[PDB]
Amino acid sequence: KYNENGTITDAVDCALDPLSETKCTLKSFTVEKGIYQTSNFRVQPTESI
Amino acid sequence: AYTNSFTRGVYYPDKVFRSSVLHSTQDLFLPFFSNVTWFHD
Amino acid sequence: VCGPKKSTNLVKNKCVNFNFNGLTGTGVLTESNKKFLPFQQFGRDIADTT
Amino acid sequence: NQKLIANQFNSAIGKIQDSLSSTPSALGKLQDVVNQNAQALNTLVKQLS
């Protein structure tokens, strides 16, 4: 979050938590009430047969 | 010894001036609330 | 290790082809009221435009 | 019942004014249209790069 003077006042890590992922995907520093699609769960293979 | 990084370790990605905007950038950063090693050695 | 780089006189209030180090473009250069950080070289707008 | 109707209408228009002043989501449609237009333009600009 850049200020008007060119310095940064806050930062959000996208991988910190689902709330942070919502903050990153909305590209806004404040999340309004509702539901937002953020990621896509995919089960990965474990063995090669 | 170990301790909490909190929100430290953020540096300016590049020498670009930006005013009152939110920028999403991917680069090498210290993870927030990460466990960092403490030395006294 | 590189050779010398040429320099030209600055022109304002006229459509010119400007080349500042690695940033090239065409436009009109006017006086700015903004303030840059000491290490910053150029400013970018919200649409990834210098 | 002219006076009662007049008073009720005045109170109703006052309540509408208060609701417009207070509720920010009342004008969601126009803001959504403007946001969609801005998003389309910004997407085009990003795709230019």
Angle at C4 between CA C3 and CA C5, to 5 degrees: 120
Burial class (CB in 10 A: 0-12, 13-18, 19+), A16: middle
| Distance in Å from the first CA to the final CA of chain B | 12
Which chains are adjacent to chain C, needing at least 3 Cβ pairs under 8 Å?
A, B, D
A9 interfaces chain C, CB cutoff of 8 Å:
no
- Give the SS3 label for residue C20: strand
Which chain D residue is nearest to residue C46, measuring alpha carbons?
D42
Measured CA to CA, the distance from residue D35 to residue D15 in angstroms comes to 28
The structure was resolved to a resolution in Å of: 3.5
**Are the beta carbons of B20 and A4 separated by less than 8 Å?**
yes
Residue C41 CA to residue C27 CA, distance in Å, equals 18
Q: If DSSP codes are grouped into helix, strand and coil, which group holds residue B35?
A: strand
Mutate to test the interface with C, among D37, D41, D45 (most CBs of C within 10 A): D45
Q: Are D47 and C48 in contact (CB under 8 A)?
A: no
Residues recorded for chain A: 49
- Cβ proximity of A19 and B40 under 8 Å: no
CA D2 to chain centroid, in Å, comes to 32
H/E element holding C24? strand C23-28
DSSP string covering chain A: -B-TTS-B-----TTS-HHHHHHHHHTSSSPPSS--------PPP----
Cα angle D34-D44-C23, degrees, rounded to a multiple of 5: 120
Q: CA-CA distance, A16 to B31, in Å (whole number)?
A: 8
Interface partners of chain D (CB pairs < 8 Å, 3 or more) are: C
State the structure-solving technique. Answer: cryo-EM
The CA distances from residue B32 to A9, A25, A30, C47, D42, in Å, are 15, 18, 18, 28, 30
Identity of the amino acid at B2: Y
Give the tokens for residue A47. Answer: 């063995």
How do C15-20 and C23-28 pair as beta strands? antiparallel
Question: What number of residues does chain C have?
Answer: 50
Helix %, strand %, coil % of chain B (to 5): 0, 20, 80
